[PDB]
Subunit: 146 residues, 3 copies
Amino acid sequence: DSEIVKALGDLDELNSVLGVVSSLYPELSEVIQKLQNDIFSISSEIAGFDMNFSDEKVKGIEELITNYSKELEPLRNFVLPGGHIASSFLHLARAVCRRAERSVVTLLKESKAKEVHAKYLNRLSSLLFVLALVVNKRTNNPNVIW
Amino acid sequence: KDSEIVKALGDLDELNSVLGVVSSLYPELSEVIQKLQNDIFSISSEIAGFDMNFSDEKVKGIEELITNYSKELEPLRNFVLPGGHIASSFLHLARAVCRRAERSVVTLLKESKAKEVHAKYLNRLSSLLFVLALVVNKRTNNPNVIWR
Amino acid sequence: DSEIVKALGDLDELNSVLGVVSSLYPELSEVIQKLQNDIFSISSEIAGFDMNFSDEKVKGIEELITNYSKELEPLRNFVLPGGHIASSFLHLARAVCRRAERSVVTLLKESKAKEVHAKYLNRLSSLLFVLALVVNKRTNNPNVIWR
């Protein structure tokens, strides 16, 4: 499937931007490597393997979204990528993750992916957004608003 | 969620993210870059249904920037490859992602799912990013990398 | 045609990520600029020019893969992007290079690209992965590994 290879390709780019983020903001290495691990596992299942990837994974993202949000304050306006370099790469990560989300959904409608795959990616982009806001807040970088 | 529209919007989001990376790396151009990001968000917004009278004045604004920034540059006699100062390399990348976003919006031009001004702007923008990449290398004393 | 344009765009994105790597790890600038030079020559050929880009290019890449791999030990894990910043960007380069490969291979089937283009790009992604490990090895950054 040219569709399968596309999805895998979007996933590889995502894992790569994630590594960039990790390299720039080591403090989040532990959390980002776990997300990268999950992406590789998702990639392996789409490729034909079976890691028994379950919904527990998605709830795990939800939990992170919640715990990191406790540091943030209200999305007053719309945020434009900016601030700390790592924050800007988290935005890039969010965008690539969303592209990978569209690709996985495409395979999902043909039964070549699991709903948990598309769902995990759906929550992941949200978490990536929260992490960009977190980086700017910890490093005292104002977010850029529209 | 018409795959062609969400795709165009995805490319635009990536473009604004790369532009943010440039701004982080070269804060001396943040003011100019944020204005470009604001324009990308407006374009994106209109394509998503929220028209905001995005005017062709925007395009003129870019052509003007292209003109004033080139005044700093010598006549070019080589094909430039991405390189030099880190911000210059990312500007070249912004341009490449801008050209990809340009393609998705042009596709939306048919069926009139996007304005003709959106496509025009993106086109001039990719040219501006090229000029800015050269400007950054010139101001930081970084030779441009050239083909061959 | 839109196929050609998309292929050219992926090659252009690839060349830019390579430029980013060079700026971050200047000690590899000479070899990375040669790859950038070939990507541009390849793009030119797809756009209509002729640089007489030959299999000799491909062989040059395999030689680089071989020689750089000599600094490395046997690999017993799947490596995830990480470590030194330039290593993470080489992985990105590899990913975008694979995307460019897919587009060029699509042109191959319609005789809008040369077989040497596709093969060059296929070898290139392998070289990029090796360069990523070499960078981490030389800068004492452990590779990130699945699990």
